[PDB]
Symmetry: C3
């Protein structure tokens, strides 16, 4: 018969899912940024530019004011409209003569004799064009479009575990187990060798696997515990849908107190553990201790949940069981993000190198 | 006694191997290629070259025909033979005057006054030499030699699971369990506390762990199932070698319906799960439920497979159990491949940057 | 009742820790080095320098001797003191006229007419300044400070498993189980539903989970074995602290014969397996088969270890259980190291590219 501790294996596998919910899934390697370094290179270039170039960014009546493009439209014989926003952003702090003179001294361009200034200008313009071409690589905007946020991932994990965007509180306010469709008895709710369960998410599957009820508390209801049964008082023959207090006494078997540094491999290993504990029969696959007939919670039957989507002839969990598919989506999005962070590293490092060379007065003369 | 579900843990571990066979192990991150970008840079260089350089690649009697090196041997006072193949490939489409004039307009070299053309040529020749030096890095050809194919990996996994290069079909045509050496009784086939098994691969180990036979179907033969025993009809005291129908009723407990994105970590975790379920005794290590004496399939004995290669005094599975060693080889080859893909990324990104600069007419003047 | 094989799951999880101890945790991807390539670039630069520059590194009375900076202090009107150590290291082999003439021929600078030499010098000086700026990136010294050693990691793993810096030998010389605090009886030592254990490390936890004693050898003492019980003879009601022979008969259930290529993911999966097998009760969490009351080793009680640090209301193992926290530290240090190796790759590849260009006589003329 099924007794104390018999479902420890399944509980561990399901809790490895549950623990990733709430706001515990953390995205560490995050937005690798190079825009400040690029902006610094662009502003160095504008500072080094001839004063008649900076003058194009000034209002005709007030030298300290940025040019208005209705007041002074850009010349049509130029590609200036294609670059004006970035140029004007570089020029704005420089419209102040005190800020500009400071930047010239800071970048070591002050006092440079004309020929030496020309050669410094040439190297800076070359390095700036190189910085733009590295920062504007297509696999940069692509990589950028592949990055997600801790937020988006957290919401999708909560969907697979709770069919909700946020984890329900300790009383499970707003939550209704089994999507409101629980009826009749435990085996109708949790499934059998011939019928699928009503559990569409990870939390309700854990409830089928681990909840005691009013008849098994002294026996099979201890499958996931050691000392005492969860004590739900679940009476599915009278009130099929369990209460939030009932659900929380099962959730507290899992670690909802820590955090997990998300990783596609972490998600994979957890999904694989659940998926391969599925016992494939002719009509259903069963997760949990199972002796005979159905997942009624009786010590002679089963403490388990059943799925019709995978069998000994068809189905793969991360594609055909909806809640495991949704969690596989998080792994997929984590992989893309992880590769992007790696790809966005090269421009970042190269732009730092360029900014260092642009501030080396000796190099500016050599590379000219 | 051993009964329904007692081997779910071991089945899950073994099926995590079996599911990687057939053509389900997929290599995602594949050949990172930069040869098209390099070829484009080389053809840009040839187009920009002086017309008397392109003329060296033409037949003396037909300007549209490539030079024949028997008809017109290359000068010995040059390193031209060391570069001719790549140069001739760049020059071939350019031998057509219409294609060449188009490429000149496309690369924005047409109409350039002589001094501006010379400076553009200088920058392109410099960028092309840089592209070659990046593309010809030694850790590029090395990385290239470390890359494998989904095919080679799939064949080695099928060797560890089936001792064959392809997964046997549903009737196991062409396959003979236990390499034709099964004899006497189940315990002679599957091993004991004193003797090793006849199972040399993963599939036959799963058979020892999970097959019912004609005597245990109502008891220990349900160790890996829920509702019904596999129903092999295996009668090893009369016909020791099971049939293909018998083997398939056990294989269908595993997920042969999906695919796995291969990963050294995936392989590691799966090998580690199997290896540490091995129960180390003085003379053998046992995988599977074991109560007494041997792996006979009796409810009082064992549903298991034994190996003499590892014990409580010696042996490590991924080195001393042949089938686990072969699968560790796939992990090793996956690691090399994964690092190579990463190393081949840098040349790829740099060549894209160079091609962008070479097509920027403003940069070609600045960098000269 | 608890019997043969009932703790195989827990043993596998704990042995996955134990196997990482001793000197079996191997750091593969190790120090990515670029200093030899940098030193080669710096020495190429010094060789190409004007002879009057090399002369600054010579003693005034002996041209073959390095300048002494007390004898001939460096000029104050220069930044020479900021670069002298690296310059002098590049110059030292060149003070020998035969070595210098050889290096000039080797780098193909001999016989170069003056204008061609000047242009070669210009390109080499530019490439050398670029090499320095890449090699001196801040995320290089940072990455360098993040790298650890197989040694440091091995010592911290041995702390989590043994509370010692090295793994005890087969007789456990120098080791005292349970930090010398074992007393009274098995349940006082290994814990209960109300009390924590005396086991502060991984080895002593495995002892609580898997050791037989003088009363359970024929029953619960076989929870982690197949054929024969470990045979400790442990008699905690008389001599609470087990002997080294006793401890070794339990350790030999784990694989101490191989090696593991360390990986944060490897550590994570192993920590997660242990952490989620912890059965959370109101006052303790229990690892191991548990039927009633305590971890006394009786077949009706438990073969297990208990922790008060995590419960069904608080605690996360990798932060609140000291030995699991220490092992999580190894994972954290492995992640930093793995990212560093990746970041230190870019300078390495770029310096190889520069050294190749500096040795290409054709490029030295083009890039001038
Ligand atoms: C770092 O800082 C530097 C400055 O130090 C900055 O350089 C500036 O770059 C921009 C963009 O590359 C340059 O913009 C060019 O400006 C010229 C000059 O236009 C003025 O002068 C002419 C008289 O010669 C007037 O007619 C005109 O009204 C302006 O007052 C333009 O002629 C250029 O436009 C032509 O070329 C473009 C291609 O580059 C075409 O897209 C465009 O349609 C124009 O084509 C015309 O001329 C072509 C000549 O080849 C011809 O083929 C076409 O048929 C057509 O007739 C261009 O807009 C600007 O001058 C630079 N400033 C200085 C002081 O050098 C860098 O941009 C900055 N780096 C970064 C990355 O921010
Ligand atoms: C991008 O596109 C450019 C063109 O825009 C292309 O440039 C070509 O590069 C190749 C390889 O670098 C150059 O090949 C050289 O050609 C000269 C010229 O040979 C002709 O003219 C001489 C008369 O001066 C005739 O005697 C001869 O028969 C040819 O008609 C050769 O002299 C060069 O060979 C010498 O130097 C090599 C080292 O670079 C040696 O390996 C070789 O043995 C030769 O050594 C001889 O001269 C040495 C002088 O230093 C001397 O030391 C030796 O003792 C010996 O006497 C070389 O083959 C070619 O000219 C370039 N073309 C143009 C138009 O510039 C790039 O290759 C292309 N980029 C890429 C990456 O594809
Ligand atoms: C690769 O190999 C090359 C050689 O091929 C090597 O180049 C050497 O680089 C160093 C460092 O960049 C150069 O050092 C400079 O040396 C000059 C010359 O000093 C001598 O001559 C003057 C007379 O002109 C004497 O007065 C003096 O006593 C020496 O005999 C120095 O003048 C330079 O110092 C000034 O500039 C530095 C900034 O770069 C300041 O930090 C320093 O305080 C000095 O400032 C003074 O002059 C400034 C002028 O702008 C002025 O603004 C200040 O107020 C102040 O008055 C500097 O030390 C050396 O000359 C190069 N050698 C050659 C032959 O070219 C590369 O270093 C090497 N690459 C690598 C990476 O190893
Ligand atoms: C589960 O199976 C037991 C044993 O046959 C039976 O008593 C229950 O009614 C059933 O749900
Ligand atoms: C396995 O062990 C059982 C129980 O002792 C015995 O009956 C079988 O004959 C043996 O193979
Ligand atoms: C463990 O529990 C058993 C069964 O109740 C009891 O006999 C032992 O004394 C206790 O330690």
């Amino acid at each position: 018969n099924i007794g104390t501790g018999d479902n420890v294996l399944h509980r561990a596998a399901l809790c490895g899912i549950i623990e990733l919910a709430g706001k515990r899934a953390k995205l560490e390697t995050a937005l690798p940024n190079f825009q400040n370094e690029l902006n610094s290179i662009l502003e160095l270039n504008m500072t080094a530019a001839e004063p008649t170039w900076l003058d194009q960014f000034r209002d005709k009546d007030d030298r300290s004011k940025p040019r208005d493009l209705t007041k002074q439209p850009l010349p049509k014989d130029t590609n200036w409209a294609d670059h004006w926003t970035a140029w004007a952003k570089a020029a704005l702090p420089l419209l102040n003569d005190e800020t500009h003179q400071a930047k010239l001294k800071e970048y070591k361009l002050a006092g440079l004799q004309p020929e030496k200034l020309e050669r410094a200008r040439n190297t800076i313009r070359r390095l700036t064009a190189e910085a733009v071409a590295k920062a504007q690589d297509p696999t940069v905007a692509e990589s950028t479009a592949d990055l997600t946020t801790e937020e988006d991932l957290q919401k999708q994990i909560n969907q697979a575990v709770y069919s909700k965007d946020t984890e329900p509180d300790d009383d499970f306010n707003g939550y209704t187990a089994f999507e409101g469709k629980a009826s009749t008895n435990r085996q109708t709710i949790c499934g059998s060798a011939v019928a699928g369960s009503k559990a569409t998410n990870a939390m309700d599957a854990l409830f089928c696997v681990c909840a005691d009820d009013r008849t098994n508390g002294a026996d099979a209801g201890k499958a996931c515990v050691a000392g005492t049964a969860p004590g739900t008082g679940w009476n599915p023959g009278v009130t099929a849908t369990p209460t939030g207090t009932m659900l929380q006494k099962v959730r507290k078997l899992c670690n909802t107190h820590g955090k997990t540094t998300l990783s596609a491999a972490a998600i994979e290993g957890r999904l694989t553990a659940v998926g391969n504990l599925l016992t494939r029969g002719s009509a259903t696959s069963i997760l949990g201790s199972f002796l005979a007939t159905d997942c009624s919670g009786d010590q002679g039957s089963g403490m388990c949940v059943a799925y019709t989507e995978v069998t000994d002839a068809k189905g793969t969990p991360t594609k055909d069981i909806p809640w495991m598919q949704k969690l596989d989506s998080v792994r997929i999005k984590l992989q893309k993000h992880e590769r992007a962070v790696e790809k966005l590293g090269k421009p970042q490092h190269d732009l730092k190198t360029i900014l260092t060379l642009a501030k080396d007065p000796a190099y500016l003369q050599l590379a000219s």
